[PDB]
Structure 1
């Protein structure tokens, strides 16, 4: 339930911030936080390879457990739900009966002080992880390994989820958050339920400064530039694109499909995305 401000500044008119209601702990588990190296968009050559990045708030990276088969059968208690600035979702702190502590990302409806567990025989109850084949067909699910033992890859962003449609052999058919129908291997783990913090998309950053807080530096349009800088650069006064709208590097940017043609995973995608 996003929070509103009164229009006591120009920017507070539309600025909205998250409610943080589901959060119970306001400083991270010291045993699970390591420093996050800000890059500013530059690679090991020193070159900007992703434009308009930098200048954002300092952050500590929280180690997240995307391979919950690491601890089969060991029930954990949900001890907290915390902010993670490296994510759109929230994270939940788990106290295993083992004594070990880990971070998973928080599904919607997960309550502190409840049990979760992972394994082939786990109950079909929000927050539990099972290999995809044992989850009943029709279930919503998140944090899905794209390949067995390689790590939870799909549906990790706030509010997202994947639904299980059916099976054929060693594979189950998933409706991804995009609408794509894909075969994913049944031995791939997945956590039941959709990711929490669904109102994340309903936030209005409100002013330019908020973008700078998130590390996002001002984007400058090709039309604003000169021909030495962009296909859209130049012109006396304003100017329409005057050619197929291109990127800074020459390729067309309004429809040109860029997925590799002979990519071996094509055998497993069933229906390309919707909308």
Structure 2
């Protein structure tokens, strides 16, 4: 449950912070963090290729186990649940009876002290990873591989989940977090349950500086610029778009579809998304 503040400054009026009440360990596993090269939106040429990036808090990257079929049949115990600044979900530290220590995305409801396990035989239980073909139809899953052995790709953000709607040959049918209906191969691994921290979206950033902490630099409207800069630039005084609303680079940006036409995965998208 999000936490409010009393209005003792202008910004505390609506600023809200997470409860952190599920967190049980306030520093990371030294053997599993590595440094995070901040890019500032720049590429190997040095050019801003994503605008309005930089200046955020320093962070260490916690290595997450997105495969899990690494260690079939080897159970692990949930030793702590910790904060990860590289993702919306919380992460959970796993101590394998193997003696190996790993991080996973923390599903909703997972408890410090329970044991999880990965494999075809695993119990349909929160925290376990199975190939999709062995999960009963209707089950809510997360951290879903898209192609077998290639890594958990879908449903990873705070509060998300996919639902198994049915089967067809080597493939199962998933309803993704977007509501699209896709075929995913049955040998693709997924973890039972939804991702935790569902309250994440109810957070009110509260002031400008909070965004600046996250590496989000201020965003400038096209309408505020000059014609050298943007299709919406210029005009005397304020001005409507005066053309179909466009990006800085000329393409239309109110409805124009941009998925590539002849893309091969189209044979596996059943129904495009919703709302």
Deviations 1:231-250 (A, max 9, x none): 00000000000000000000
The C-alpha deviation readout for 1:182-213, integer Å capped at 9, x for no partner, is 00000000000000000000000000000000
Structure 2 residue aligned with 1:196: 196
For 2:240, the equivalent position in structure 1 comes to 240
Other structure's SS at 1:242 match: coil
Partner SS for 2:103: strand
**Offset, 1:165:** 0.4
SS of equivalent residue, structure 2 residue 25: coil
TM superposition shift of 1:2? 0.2
Show CA shifts across 1:27-72 (max 9, x none): 0000000000000000000000000000000000000000000000
Aligned 1:1-275 pairs, distance under 5 A: 1-275=1-275
Q: How far off is 1:143 after superposition?
A: 0.3
CA distance in 1, matches of 2:193, 2:87: 18
Per-residue deviation, 1:224: 0.2
Aligned-residue offset at 1:98: 0.2
Task: Report the Cα offset of residue 166 of structure 1.
Answer: 0.3
Alpha-carbon distance, 1:151 to partner: 0.2
SS in 1 for 2:247: coil
Secondary structure of the equivalent of 2:12? helix
1:117: how far off?
A: 0.2
Aligned partner of residue 182 in structure 2, secondary structure: strand
- State the 1:126 CA deviation: 0.2
**Per-residue CA distance 1:82-103 (angstroms, 9 max, x = gap):** 0000000000000000000000
Q: Distance in 1 between matches of 2:211 and 2:229?
A: 24
Q: Output one character per residue of 1:163-182: Cα deviation in whole Å (capped at 9) or x when no partner.
A: 00000000000000000000
Can you list the C-alpha shifts for 1:106-129, whole angstroms capped at 9, x where unaligned? 000000000000000000000000
Across the aligned residues of Structure 1 and Structure 2, the Cα RMSD in angstroms comes to: 0.2
Which 4+ runs in 1 deviate beyond 2 A? none
**In 2, Cα distance between equivalents of 1:85 and 1:64:** 13
The whole-number CA distance in structure 2 between the counterparts of 1:111 and 1:80 is: 9
| Distance in structure 1 (CA, Å) of the matches to 2:262 and 2:240 | 36
Q: How far apart are the structure 2 equivalents of 1:122 and 1:61?
A: 29
Equivalents in 1 of 2:115, 2:232: separation in Å? 57
Partner SS for 1:229: coil
Q: Distance in 2 between matches of 1:263 and 1:137?
A: 28
Structure 1 residue 81 displacement after superposition? 0.2
Shift of 1:147: 0.2
Shift of 1:159: 0.1
Whole-angstrom distance in 2 between the partners of 1:128 and 1:244: 49
TM-superposed deviation, 1:264? 0.2
Q: How many residues align?
A: 275
* CA displacement at 1:8 relative to structure 2: 0.2
